Structure formats: C-alpha cells, structure tokens
C-alpha cells in the first residue's frame, strides 16, 4: 500500500494524496473498543467545519442492539436518505479490516475479506480529497492503492 498512516489520533482528518479513480482502494485496519456506540469513516470534500465539509460517503457502523451500518451523504449540512445494512461484521472488542473500493458508479466495501455493501455515488468522487475517521474506534493503519 501507498501513503500509509500508522496509529493516528482519532478524530483523524487527513488529505487523500491522489485521486479516487475506479479501482482505487482505501484500506483501514483497527479495532472496536468495548464501549463503542458507533464510529464513522467519512470521505469528504475538504475539511471545513463551517460550513461543514460535504461528505460524499459516510460509512457508519453502529453497535447498539444487533448492530448495523448506516451509509449516507451530507450536502450543504443536510443528510440525505440513509442506506442501512443489517448484516454487520463489526463487533466490540474485535479487530477489523475495511477495504473501500472506488468504482465508476459506486463504492464497494469489504470488511474482514467479505463483501459487505455497495453505495452509489451521490457526489462526484473527484470532489473527495479528505478522509475523516471519528468516534469510538482505534485505528492501527490507513493505506491506499491508487489506480
Ligand atoms: Cl456526523
Ligand atoms: Na465531522
């Protein structure tokens, strides 16, 4: 992998060092603490907080009850229609690997080597230049494979 970041402080906000062209991978390895409620991986158009940077792809594992993953997009500080996946591989106290693959029409995400979900583009992926990781999660490494 390319442009690897080790043991970042959370919240992490970093510039993605090349374009997210089809076939590009974002690989995030970490673990979920025992008290986690949720965490998220946000692919953003910049890092502004005011107005808040648009979020092309919000990938949001939630741990209450049986758990799920919520995905959405934030445009001009308004969330769109949530996409929910109930078949969640994440668990408190367990390590994980997330691989986000950028495709022409969508993202595809695999967790722990297994296909997890698709998310159709709502913002042009060319507008994504920033990776945010927030919430109750421990990140070991972030790396990229650019196409
Ligand atoms: Cl948020
Ligand atoms: Na945020």
Curated annotation (Swiss-Prot):
Residues 12-145 form the Galectin domain. Transmembrane segments: none annotated. Changing residue 62 to H: Abolishes localization to cytoplasmic vesicles in case of infection by S.typhimurium. It comes from the Eukaryota. The record marks 52 as: Critical for binding to sialylated and sulfated oligosaccharides. Ubiquitous. Selective expression by prostate carcinomas versus normal prostate and benign prostatic hypertrophy. Contains two homologous but distinct carbohydrate-binding domains. Beta-galactoside-binding lectin that acts as a sensor of membrane damage caused by infection and restricts the proliferation of infecting pathogens by targeting them for autophagy. Detects membrane rupture by binding beta-galactoside ligands located on the lumenal side of the endosome membrane; these ligands becoming exposed to the cytoplasm following rupture. Restricts infection by initiating autophagy via interaction with CALCOCO2/NDP52. Required to restrict infection of bacterial invasion such as S.typhimurium. Also required to restrict infection of Picornaviridae viruses. Homodimer. Interacts with CALCOCO2/NDP52. Interacts with PDPN; the interaction is glycosylation-dependent; may participate in connection of the lymphatic endothelium to the surrounding extracellular matrix. This is Galectin-8. The chain holds residues 8 to 154 of 317 of the full protein.
